[PDB]
Symmetry: D2
Subunit: 123 residues, 4 copies
C-alpha cells in the first residue's frame, strides 16, 4: 500500500482521543479507538478501509472507519463512522468528518445521528 507506512500508527485528535491503526497492503484498516469524551472508556475495536493505490498528483488518500461503542466495560448503543483523507508530508494529518448514530425508537429516529469533524495528527 502506497501510504501503508504513513497511516499505520498512533493518531490523536483535537479532543485528546487516541486512534491506533494498522493499514494492510489490501486496503484494510484495523485497530483500536479510545475517546476522551462521551459514554466511552478504554479501547474499542475499529475496522475500516483506505485507498491503497492513491493518485500521485498531490491529492490526499481517502479512508474511513467505524467504531461500535461496545467493549468489555461499557455499551453506549451507538456507532461512529469517520470519513476523510490522509495528507502526508512534513506534518501529516487525517482530516475527517463523522456520523454518530444511536439506537432509537422509531418515533425518535429523527434525532438519532450527530455529525462533527475531527482532525488527527501524530503529535
Amino acid at each position: 500500500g502506497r501510504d501503508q507506512a504513513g497511516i499505520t500508527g498512533t493518531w490523536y485528535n483535537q479532543l485528546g482521543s487516541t486512534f491506533i491503526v494498522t493499514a494492510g497492503a489490501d486496503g484494510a484498516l484495523t485497530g483500536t479507538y479510545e475517546s476522551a469524551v462521551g459514554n466511552a472508556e478504554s479501547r474499542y475495536v475499529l475496522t475500516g478501509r483506505y485507498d491503497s493505490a492513491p493518485a500521485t498528483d498531490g491529492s490526499g488518500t481517502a479512508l474511513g472507519w467505524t467504531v461500535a461503542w461496545k467493549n468489555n466495560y461499557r455499551n453506549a448503543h451507538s456507532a461512529t463512522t469517520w470519513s476523510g483523507q490522509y495528507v502526508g508530508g512534513a506534518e501529516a494529518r487525517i482530516n475527517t468528518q463523522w456520523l454518530l448514530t444511536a439506537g432509537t425508537t422509531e418515533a425518535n429516529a429523527w434525532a438519532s445521528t450527530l455529525v462533527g469533524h475531527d482532525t488527527f495528527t501524530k503529535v
Copy 2:
C-alpha cells in the same frame, strides 16, 4: 449477537445498490458492496461494526461500515462510510446517513465530502 441473524444477508437501497453482509457474534460486519451509481462497478470490500448487545426497549441497533472504492476493476480514489441503525420486525430496514470523501488537493479539501442518506430493505 442479538441481531446477528437479522442483519446478516443481502440488502438493497433506493438507488438499487446491493449490500451483502455477515454479522459476527463479536460485533464485526464483513461483506461486499455493489453501487448502482457513480464511479463504481462490481463488488467492493466492506468492513464495519454493530452493537452486538442492543437495548431491549424497542430501540434500533446501531451500526456502521466503510467501502473504499478500489477493487480489481476500478479505483475512484474515495471512500464512503454509512452510519445508521437496524430496525427489525415485519419489515426490516437499515436506515443510514453516509459520508463520501474523495482524495483532493489541500486547496480543494473544502469540497472533498458528499453527504447523503440510504435506506436498505431486504426486498
Copy 3:
C-alpha cells in the same frame, strides 16, 4: 419573476408531519413559518432563507435553503436548524433536503452539538 416562485410558494409537509409555509420572492428570498411535529417545539417559528431564482433549464432541481431558530413567544429550545436541498417540480413536486440542527453547548460538549438528518417535503 423567480422561475419557480409560484412552485415553491405555499404549504409543504414532511414525513414527520411538520408544516412549512413559505413565500418565495422574485429576488431569491424565502420567508415564512415552520411548525415541527417533533422535538422541543410548539406552534410556529419564523424562517428565512434563499433559493436560486434563475435555475438551469436542463432537468436539474432548484437549489435552496432556510433556517429556523427554535425560539418563539411560547418556548425556546436554544437551537437552530438549517435545511439545504433542492425543489423538484412537476406532477409530484418535492423539496428534498438534508438538515443540521445545532444546539448551544458548552465548549466541552461542542463535539455533541449538531444533529444531522433528512426531510422530504411534498404538497400533499
Copy 4:
C-alpha cells in the same frame, strides 16, 4: 435587545479566507453578505438567517444559522449553502459551524447533490 446582537453583528472571516458581514436584529434575524474565497463565486452574495436572541446564561453558546444562494449580479452557481452553528463570545470570539452545500441536479444524480463541511469564523 438580542443578548448577543452586538457580539454577532459585524465582519467575520473563516479559515478559507471568506468574509461574512452580518447584522443581527433584536428579533432573531440575521441579514448580510457573504464573499467566498473558493468555488464558483465572485463578489458578494445575499445571506439571511436566524439566531437565538435569548440564549441560556450557563456557558453555552448561541445557536444560529444562515443561507446563501450562489446567484448574484455576476454569476450563478445553481447551488445554496446553509451554515448551522453556534456563536461563542469572549476574548477570542468564534462562530463554529458545519455546512451543507446543495447543487441543483437531475433526479438520477441527486445522490451526489450535497457537500458537507465545517467553517470556523473569527473576528481577526
